[PDB]
Amino acid sequence: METLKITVYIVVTFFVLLFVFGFLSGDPARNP
Amino acid sequence: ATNRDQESSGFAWWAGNARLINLSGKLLGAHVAHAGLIVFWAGAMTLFELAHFIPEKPMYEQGLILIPHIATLGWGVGPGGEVVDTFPFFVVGVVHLISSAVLGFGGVYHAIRGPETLEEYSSFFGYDWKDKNKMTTILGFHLIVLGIGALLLVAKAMFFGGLYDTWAPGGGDVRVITNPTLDPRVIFGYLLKSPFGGEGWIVSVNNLEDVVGGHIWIGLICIAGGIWHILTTPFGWARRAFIWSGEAYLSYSLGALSMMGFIATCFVWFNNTVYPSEFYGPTGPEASQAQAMTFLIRDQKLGANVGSAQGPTGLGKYLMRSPTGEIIFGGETMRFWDFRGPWLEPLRGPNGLDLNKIKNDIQPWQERRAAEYMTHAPLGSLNSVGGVATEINSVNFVSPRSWLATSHFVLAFFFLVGHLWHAGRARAAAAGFEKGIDRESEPVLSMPSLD
Amino acid sequence: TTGERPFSDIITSVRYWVIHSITIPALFIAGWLFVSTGLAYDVFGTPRPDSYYAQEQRSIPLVTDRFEAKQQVETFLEQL
Amino acid sequence: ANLWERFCNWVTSTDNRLYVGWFGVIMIPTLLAATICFVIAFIAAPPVDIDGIREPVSGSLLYGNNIITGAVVPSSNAIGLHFYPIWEAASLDEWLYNGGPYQLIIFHFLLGASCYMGRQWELSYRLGMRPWICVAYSAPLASAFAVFLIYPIGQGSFSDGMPLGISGTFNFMIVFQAEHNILMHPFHQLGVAGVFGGALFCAMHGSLVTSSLIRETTETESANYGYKFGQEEETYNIVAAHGYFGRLIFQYASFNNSRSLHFFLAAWPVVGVWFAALGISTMAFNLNGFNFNHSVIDAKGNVINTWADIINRANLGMEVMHERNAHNFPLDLA
Amino acid sequence: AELTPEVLTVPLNGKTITLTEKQYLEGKRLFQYACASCHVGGITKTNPSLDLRTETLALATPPRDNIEGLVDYMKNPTTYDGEQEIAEVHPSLRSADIFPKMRNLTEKDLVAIAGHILVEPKILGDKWGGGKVYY
Amino acid sequence: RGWFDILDDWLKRDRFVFVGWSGILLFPCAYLALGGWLTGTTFVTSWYTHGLASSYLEGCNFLTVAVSTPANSMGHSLLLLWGPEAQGDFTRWCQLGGLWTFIALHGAFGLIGFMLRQFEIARLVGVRPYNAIAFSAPIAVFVSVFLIYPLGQSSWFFAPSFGVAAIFRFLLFFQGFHNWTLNPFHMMGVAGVLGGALLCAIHGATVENTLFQDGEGASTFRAFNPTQAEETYSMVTANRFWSQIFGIAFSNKRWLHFFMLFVPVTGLWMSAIGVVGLALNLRSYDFISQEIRAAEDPEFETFYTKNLLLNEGIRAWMAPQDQPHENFVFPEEVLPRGNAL
Amino acid sequence: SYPIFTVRWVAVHTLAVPTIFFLGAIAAMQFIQR
Ligand code: CLA
Ligand code: HEC
Ligand SMILES: CC1=C(/C=C/C(C)=C/C=C/C(C)=C/C=C/C=C(C)/C=C/C=C(C)/C=C/C2=C(C)CCCC2(C)C)C(C)(C)CCC1
Ligand code: OEX
Ligand SMILES: [Fe+2]
Structure with a gap:
C-alpha cells in the first residue's frame, strides 16, 4: 500500500497533466 | 430600436x-x-x-x-x-x-x-x-x-x-x-x-x-x-x-x-x-450524533453500562470504535464520527469519546442541546x-x-x-x-x- | 386555416367579453354555490366534516355486500 | 514537430475510429478502471459489510448470486464519506470487506462519465457541430452524480449510494421511498413526466416519421432501404406527418417545424431527468417529498386517511424493515 | 364525528372542566409551538418509554392525567415517579432561562396544552401516544 | 349519395378538431372518462369503498385525490348506474365505486376510439398507421393494469385508482406483494421506457446539434420551412459523431425512427405480459435457489433478500389500511420490524 | 365573416364550461371550515 499509492498518484497526474496541457496546447485552434 | x-x-x-x-x-x-x-x-x-x-x-x-x-x-x-x-x-x-x-x-x-x-x-x-x-x-x-x-x-x-x-x-x-x-x-x-x-x-x-x-x-x-x-x-x-x-x-x-x-x-x-x-x-452529522448522545445520556441515567452495552450486531450500542480507533457514537451515526460540535467536545478526550467523561461529567446544557438537536434534525x-x-x-x-x-x-x-x-x-x-x-x-x- | 374564427380574433373581440364577463364569473359563482350551498355533499354522497363517523363510533363504514350494498350505505348514513 | 504536437495530432484526431480527445485521456483510463473493477467485483468480490455492523452482503456471482441479484455492494457505513482507496487498507481482503471496490468504481465511473460529457463536446467541436449533446448527457450524468455521490454526501456515507447491481438498485429505490417519499416529491414527478413523456415522444416521433416515409421500395423488401445514407432528400414527408398529427389532436398542438420538434424531443426528457436528478440531489439533504400524513381530519379531529396515508403505511413498512439491525435509536436521522 | 363537550370534558383536578373549540384549537397550536418537537403524536422522541397517553399520565407520580396535574408538570416537571426533578432538561416555567419557547405561556394558555394533551387521545384513539404502529 | 355518404362527409369534414367516425366513440367516452375523473376527484369520496378521503371536497389535494376503485365485495361487477348494486341511485353509485368503473370503461372505449381515430386519420391523410401501432402499447398497458389485473384478482379493488397518490399506492403495492421490480417483464419495460426517453433525448439533441445553417440568425428554428425537401440536419455528421463517441451509430434514418417506434412500444408491451401474469399472482417473487441458500445459511445476505424483507414490511404494515375489507387486525407485535424502528 | 357555433365551439365549451364551474367549486372548498 506505500507503493501502489504513489504508483496511482503518478499515473493520475500524468493523465491529468496530459489533460491540462493538451487543452492548453491550443484547443481553440483545433476547429474545422 | x-x-x-x-x-x-x-x-x-x-x-x-x-x-x-x-x-x-x-x-x-x-x-x-x-x-x-x-x-x-x-x-x-x-x-x-x-x-x-x-x-x-x-x-x-x-x-x-x-x-x-x-x-x-x-x-x-x-x-x-x-x-x-x-x-x-x-x-x-x-x-x-x-x-x-x-x-x-x-x-x-x-x-x-x-x-x-x-x-x-x-x-x-x-x-x-x-x-x-x-x-x-x-x-x-x-x-x-x-x-x-x-x-x-x-x-x-x-x-x-x-x-x-x-x-x-x-x-x-x-x-x-x-x-x-x-x-x-x-x-x-x-x-x-x-x-x-x-x-x-x-x-x-x-x-x-x-x-x-x-x-x-x-x-x-x-x-x-x-x-x-x-x-x-x-x-x-x-x-x-x-x-x-x-x-x-x-x-x-x-x-x-x-x-x-x-x-x-x-x-x-x-x-x-x-x-x-x-x-x-444542527447539521445532518450534528443531529445523528445528538440522537446517540441523548440515549447515551438517558440510559446511563437509568444505569446502563454504556461502554459495555452491545448493539444487536456485536457493535457498541452507544460506544463503538471508528475504523481509525476512536471511541465514537454507536448506531448508524458511526458514519458521522468526523463531526465536531461544541456540545460534545467536553466528552472527547484523545481516544475519541471518554467513557469516564460520559459517566460523571455530562452537563445538563449538553443534554438539552442534544435533545434539541435530535428533534430538529x-x-x-x-x-x-x-x-x-x-x-x-x-x-x-x-x-x-x-x-x-x-x-x-x-x-x-x-x-x-x-x-x-x-x-x-x-x-x-x-x-x-x-x-x-x-x-x-x-x-x-x-x-x-x-x- | 380550416374556416373557424381565429382565437386571436374571438377572445380579443369585445363581443366575447360582452358574453364572457358575465358567464365566466357566473359559472364560477354557480360552482361556488354548488359547494357553499351544500349541493355538492348531496349529489355525490361525499360526507361533510361531521359525517364520517357517528358521535361515539369510530369504525370505518365499509361496504361488505354487493346486492345488499345500497341499503348498507343507508344503514351507515342513518347511523349518522 | 516533437512527440507532443504529434501526440495532440492523435488525441484530437477525428480519423480515430473511436475519438479520444483530451477528455478521453481521462475518460478512457478511468472508465477502463471502472469497468475492469466492476466486472471483477460483480463476479468475484467477497461479501461487503455495507451497513458497517459486521453483517456482510454478498454481491458477487461466485458467492451465490445471479445477474439480477448480483451487485457491487456499496462501501461500509463504518467508512462513511471517507476516502477509501486500496492504500487506505492494510490488506486487499480488508479493502474488499469494507466495500472499497465500490468507491473505486464510482470514483472512476463518475470522473470518467463527466469526461464522457466533455468528450461529447469535444467531438462536436472537432466536427463543426453545434455543441449541446453534452448538455443533454448532463441529464443522465447528474442522475449518476446524485445516486452515487450526492445522495451519499447528504446522507454522510457511500453505503447510501446506489449499489452497482440490478436488485441493489431496487433496494436503493425502496429505501429511498421509505425515507424520502420520492413518489410525492414533485421533482421525481417531473422526472416521470420526463421519461413517460420521453418514451411517448420517442414512440410519437418514431411512429410519425415511419408513418410518413415516401414509397421508394417494393413490399417485397424492407422500407428501410428507401433511405440511402447521406442522401439529400428527406426520407419522409414532414408535411404529411404534420397533416396527420395536426388532424389527430388539433393543428396547433403540432410541431410543423422539424427543428422545433427535435428541440422538444431533446428538451422534454432532459429537463425531466434534470429535475429528477435534482430530486435525488435535494433528497440527499433530506428535503423529502410531500408529507400529507394525517392531513384530512374531520370535525371531531379524527384522521380521515387518504391515499397518501396508505403510502405512509407502505413507507412505514419499508423503513422499519430496511437494515433491520443497523438502527439502535428510534429516529432514522440519516 | 364532531368536536363537542362530551369530548371537551376532561378531569381538572375529582372534577371535570370543559374546554372550548377556541381553547382546544389554541392549545393544539401551543403544543406544536413548544412541545410537539419531542411530543409529536403523543410519544416522546427523546424517551420513547414515556408516551403522553392518558393511562401513562394517570399512572405518573403525581397523577398527570389531570389538567391541574399537567399545568403542575409544566411549572415543575418531575420524573415519572416524582423523585427526581427535571426542569433543567424539560421545558417549564421554572426554565424560562433555558427554554425560551416557554416564556410566553400564561395560566390561561397552559391549561389549553393541558387541555390538548387530555382531549386528544379521545379524538385519535390509540394513535395518541401510539407511535408509527398507529399512524 | 345517401345518408351514410352524407354523414361520412360531415364527419370527415375538415375542421379545427377532426371528428370522424371514431369521434362518435372517442369524443363522448374520452370526455366522460376525463370528465368523470375530475368529477370523482372533486366531489366523490372513497369513504365506503376504501375508508379514504379522495376528493377536493374532503380536503385532498391534486396529489392525494383519486377516483378510487370499488369495494372488494363488488367483485368484478360492472357497476352500471342502473345495475343491481346502484339501483339507479346516483348518490349511492358514486359511493359504491361506480365512477371508477365509469372511468375505466369509458376510458377503455375512448382509447379504442383514439386508436381507431389514428387509423381513420391515417386513412384520410394517406399515411401509414404506425402511430396506431405505436398506440398499442398504451392500450395494452391500460388494458392489462386497469382491466386485466383486477379481473385476475378478486375484484376491481386491486386495480389502480385514478389518482396521483393512488397510483403511488399501486406502485408500492406491487413491490410489496408482487416484487414487480424483480419481474423480468417489468425490466424490459424499464429498458423500453428509459430507452425511449434516452432515444427521445439523444435523437432530439443529435438533430438539434447537427443542423444545417439555413438562416443567418443565431436562433436556428426559423431556418426551416416545412415545404422544403432538404434534410434540416446533417445525418452524415451525426453518424460520424456517434460512431466515434459511442462506437455505433444509426446510418439509416428510417431504421432510426423505427427503432424509436420499437423501443418504448416493445417495453410497454413487455410490461403488459408481466402484469397479466401478476393478475394471476404469477410473480417473479423469489429465486428459489437463493431462498434455499438463505434459509439454511443465516449469513448469506444479498440485496435480493433485503428487498424481500422490505416486501414483508410492505405486506404487513400497509395491508390493514390498504385492504380494509379483509378486516386485518394485525397486533403491535406481529408487525415485522427491524431493531429500534 | 365567420361562423359562431361550430364543432370547435362545442369542443371548447363542453370542456371549459364545467372547468370554470369546477374551479368555482374547488375555490369554495378552500373556505370550508372544519
Ligand atoms: C430581470 C432580468 C432581466 C433584465 C434586467 C432584462 C433587461 C433587458 N432586456 Mg431582457 N428578458 C428577460 C429578463 C431581463 N431582461 C426575460 C425573463 C425575457 C424573456 C421574456 C427577456 C427577453 C428580452 C427580449 C426579447 C429583449 C430584452 C431586452 C432587454 C433590454 C432592454 C429593454 C428595453 O430597452 O425595452 C424597453 C422596455 C420596456 C419599456 C419595459 C419596461 C420595464 C421597466 C424597465 C420595468 C422596471 C421598472 C422598475 C421597477 C423601476 C425601478 C426604478 C424606480 C424605483 C425609480 C434590457 C437590458 C431587449 C433588448 O435586447 O434590447 C436591445 C429585447 O429586445 N429582454
Ligand atoms: C424535548 C426536549 C422535549 C420538549 C420540547 C418537551 N418535552 Fe416533555 N418530555 C420530554 C422527555 C425526555 C420526557 C421524559 C422525561 C423523564 O421523566 O424521563 C418528557 C416527559 C413529559 C411528560 C411526562 C410524560 C409521562 O410519561 O409522565 C409530560 C407530561 C410532558 N413531557 C409534557 C410536555 C409538554 C406539555 C411540553 C410542551 C410545553 C413538553 N413536554 C416539551 C422531552 C420534551
Ligand atoms: C477565505 C477562507 C479561507 C481561505 C481560502 C482560500 C485561500 C481559498 C483559495 C482558493 C483558491 C486559490 C482556489 C483555486 C482554485 C482554482 C481553480 C478553480 C482552477 C480552475 C482552473 C481552470 C478553470 C482551468 C482551466 C483550463 C484548463 C484545465 C486547461 C486549459 C486551459 C484552461 C486555463 C482553460 C480558509 C479556507 C483558509 C478558511 C475559510 C475562509
Ligand atoms: O444506511 Mn442505507 O438507509 Ca440512509 O436512513 Mn438511516 O442510513 Mn440506513 O436507515 Mn434509513
Ligand atoms: Fe427525427
Missing part, C-alpha cells in the same frame, strides 16, 4: 437577453437592475423574515435563512445565539431594500434610457468583449472590490463587533477575533485537504481564526490580483487557452459559480462554525412537515440547512448546465458553426471514413 426583433439581431424573444451582448450601455442596465433585484431580495426577505420573527423561538425553527447570516456576523445576538436586539437585522433589511431603488434607477436608466453602447460616450467605460487588456481592467476593478469586501468581513470580525463564535467558551458568544491565522501553511493547508470524510476540504474550517485570516489572505490576494489585472494584459499562453468572447467569460463565470454553489451547499450542510447551529440548526418535507417521510403533520420544521443546501444544489447544477451550454456555444461561436453546419463546406464529407 436595434437588436429588438429577430430581424435585426438574429436572436429570438426567449434568447432576447442575448441581443444585449454588444450593447454595453444596455448590458450595464441589465446588470444593475439585476443587482438591484438581488439587493431587493436581500432587503425584502430580511424584512419578511423579521416581520414574521419570534425572538423566543430559535432561528432554525422559523424558516429563516437571512437573519442567521446577519446573526453569524455578530449583530444583535448574545450568549448562545439569542437575539437581544432585532434592529441590526432591520437595518440590513432597510439599507439593502432602499439601495435596490438606486440600482433599480440605474438599471432602468442604462437599460431603457441611457446610451445603448458605452463605446462612444466613455472609452474608459466602453468595452469590447474581445479587447483582452480592458477585460482584465474590469476584472482587476472587480477583484479589488471583492478584496475590499473580504476585508470588510475581517473588519467586522476584528474591530466592529466580532463574529458569532460557536466555539466560544461556555456556549456560543459573539467574539472579537483578534489573533487570526496569518500562517499560510494553515490557510492554504485547507486547500490541500481532501474533500472526503474526516478531511472535508475547506468546509472543515472549524474556528473563526482561520476564517478571518483566510479572508485576510483571500482579501489581499484579490487586491493584489486586482492590481495585477489592472496593470497587465493577458499573456500568450492564456490567449490561446481561452475564447475571448462575451459568452465565453459568462461561461467561465457560470462554471465558477457552479463550483461555489456546490461548495456553499457543502458549507451549510457540514460546517457549524461559519453556519452556527444556534442560527441554522435537517429532515423535513417539501410542505415543511418535520421528521422523516413517515412522520405525521405536527412539526413545521425544515432546517435552513436543508433549504440552503437544496436550493444551492438546484442552482449550482443548473449553473453547471449553463456553463456547459455557454462554454460549448461560445467556442462554437468563435469558430463559426453555432448556427449550424454549412452545406457547401460540410466538414465530415471532407473528413475521411472510419472503416
